[PDB]
Amino acid sequence: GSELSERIESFVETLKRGGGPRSSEEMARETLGLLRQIITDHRWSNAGELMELIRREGRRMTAAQPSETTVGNMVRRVLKIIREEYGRLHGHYAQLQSNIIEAINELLVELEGTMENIAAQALEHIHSNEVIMTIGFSRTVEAFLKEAARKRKFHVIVAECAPFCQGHEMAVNLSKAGIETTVMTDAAIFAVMSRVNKVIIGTKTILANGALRAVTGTHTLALAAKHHSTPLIVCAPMFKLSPQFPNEEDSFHKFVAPEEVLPFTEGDILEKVSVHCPVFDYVPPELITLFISNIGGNAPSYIYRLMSELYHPDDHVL
Amino acid sequence: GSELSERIESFVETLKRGGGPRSSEEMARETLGLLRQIITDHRWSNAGELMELIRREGRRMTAAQPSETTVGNMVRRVLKIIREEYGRLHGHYAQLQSNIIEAINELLVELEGTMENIAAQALEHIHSNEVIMTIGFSRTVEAFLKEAARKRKFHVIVAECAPFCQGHEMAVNLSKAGIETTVMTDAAIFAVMSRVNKVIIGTKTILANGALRAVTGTHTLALAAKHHSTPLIVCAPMFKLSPQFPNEEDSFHKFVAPEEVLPFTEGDILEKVSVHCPVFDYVPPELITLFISNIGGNAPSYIYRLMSELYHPDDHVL
Ligand SMILES: O=C(COc1ccc(Cl)cc1)N[C@H]1CC[C@H](NC(=O)COc2ccc(Cl)cc2)CC1
């Protein structure tokens, strides 16, 4: 009853104010648990009313934070699960609900295996004495690299992300496992690119065009890789896949307080200058060489088929 | 008298039949000595008659072997020296001859210094733990690399030249000095190019367009370097500079017996198949990053000015 309502609220405000939970895998787990509790703790008999209330609460979620697309695309995954179950039972009400629940359960148990799947897949993409470059921080990519390091020796060049220098803690984490790690400013990306073999980077969201929304500055790294023709690898699980297209959407970049870019102590100039701090940026699919997912490697030119396999095309608007 | 005639002949037939001397630096030395002996052992009073007989014998030389452009372009150098001396003394007959002789002497003493000059210049182009790739055999390039190796550690990938696998002896010579050397077939150029930092190659002739005539297969290596945007360096002394342009000329490629490509023992198919063995090939200037010479480094877009500095424009046809 009101527990469900206040938990939905709590989650909405946690998504709105700050980043909670930090890992987007934990965010997917939390939103899936909440969707399960909603579909269990409501008086819905027909699948249509359930889908409608799910779409409404998902609209509220998406309005809470548009840049966090995992919640929305997993809501769409739940909607596709409901559609599949209704087609199975109609192409049956209690069995409907329990079958939806076991579908969500299998989705959740395969959710925690994507990390291990990518880690296992990592070995056949790294050779000895290779030079990797990565930008920012990504749990999936550091797991990739520290799993490849157990049987291979290679160098990782971590380009810090300004202003949020998450790349520093990533470099430290990689050095923990003895992965020879060079830390540099993002300004030195093109200067060092000539000596890099591969580029491995995570992402926040993959669009239907194949493009991906990743931390700012990664588009420049992709342009450098394309200039030097080095393969650019994206190790992104299959819950960051978003059916929306690049310019049919709104609110792509996430702008945070310019205090991160230019501090308050600069004084009077802060009334004359316009400071901008875009967290995310757009990378076209032409600059991506290969996508690594929990199922296996795939070219950017197959992400649309993955969409068709994951999301109903009438649910791309929620 | 007849000594000069028979020596000129001997040289013509040596150039016509085979490669003598082997090193084109020694070829430049020999042709300069012969030009000196001609200008000394003829009864010429006016500079015009001397220039005319020089042009005639140079035409005979060029007809002996068109692919060997060092002889012709150094004949043009001697003609430019004669023009400069005549302009100095006219803008004076015995002094004319002795001044031409001392000009040839300074040209010759600076001729043997180009090797050492490039070797000295080599250090500021190689950094530690760098991956060089080269194709075929080139005395200048191996001197470059073994001089850089005295103070730096780096890897050299030598692509053998089919059919004349001169790259094997180059790899052996480089390994003599402890330069970690990988030997491969030319077929693996693009496969390995992704892990190469620089490409350093010699040449047989540099054209006025900036393009260069080098051993077959080097155009593919240059295309691979351009694809991967790796800098391509050409360590060529300033006596391989030819004022002729790419397609205003004749007889660019040198075709040798196809026995080198397909052996006689193949039998009847040798009457039905057409075999071709081009020794040289054309590399456009767009694929060269930097030229290294005895004077210093220069972009391909300055070779025309070097021409203006070396050859009179009315002597480009001999
Ligand atoms: O030591 C490093 C560290 O590299 C960087 C560290 C930091 C920065 Cl800022 C940039 C680069 N990288 C190695 C990577 C292998 C390479 N080459 C070799 O070991 C040999 O390479 C070959 C050998 C044979 C073939 Cl067929 C191809 C390449 C030496 C340098």
Swiss-Prot record, chains A, B:
Record localization: Cytoplasm, Cytosol
Q: What is the effect of changing A94V?
A: Found in a patient with Rett syndrome-like phenotype; uncertain significance
Q: Which domain of life is it from?
A: Eukaryota
Give UniProt keywords alphabetically.
Cytoplasm, Disease variant, Initiation factor, Leukodystrophy, Protein biosynthesis
Matches recorded under InterPro entries: eIF2B_beta_subunit (IPR051855), IF-2B-related (IPR000649), IF_2B-like_C (IPR042529), NagB/RpiA_transferase-like (IPR037171)
Q: According to its UniProt record, where is this protein mainly located?
A: cytoplasm
Record carries keyword Protein biosynthesis: yes
Cysteines engaged in disulfide bonds, as pairs: none
According to the record, the protein's activity is controlled as follows:
Activated by the chemical integrated stress response (ISR) inhibitor ISRIB which stimulates guanine nucleotide exchange factor activity for both phosphorylated and unphosphorylated eIF2.
Molecular function via GO? ATP binding; GTP binding; guanyl-nucleotide exchange factor activity; translation initiation factor activity
The UniProt entry's GO CC annotations, sorted and at most eight, read:
cytoplasm; cytosol; eukaryotic translation initiation factor 2B complex
One GO term of the biological process aspect: T cell receptor signaling pathway
Q: Which family does it belong to?
A: Belongs to the eIF-2B alpha/beta/delta subunits family.
Read off the PANTHER family from this record. Answer: TRANSLATION INITIATION FACTOR EIF-2B SUBUNIT BETA
Query: Which disease relates to this protein according to its record?
Result: Leukoencephalopathy with vanishing white matter 2: An autosomal recessive brain disease characterized by neurological features including progressive cerebellar ataxia, spasticity, and cognitive deficits. Brain imaging shows abnormal white matter that vanishes over time and is replaced by cerebrospinal fluid. Disease severity ranges from fatal infantile forms to adult forms without neurological deterioration. The disease is progressive with, in most individuals, additional episodes of rapid deterioration following febrile infections or minor head trauma.
Please report the name of this protein according to its UniProt entry: Translation initiation factor eIF2B subunit beta
Organism this protein belongs to? Homo sapiens
Q: Print the organism lineage.
A: Eukaryota, Metazoa, Chordata, Craniata, Vertebrata
What gene codes for this chain?
A: EIF2B2
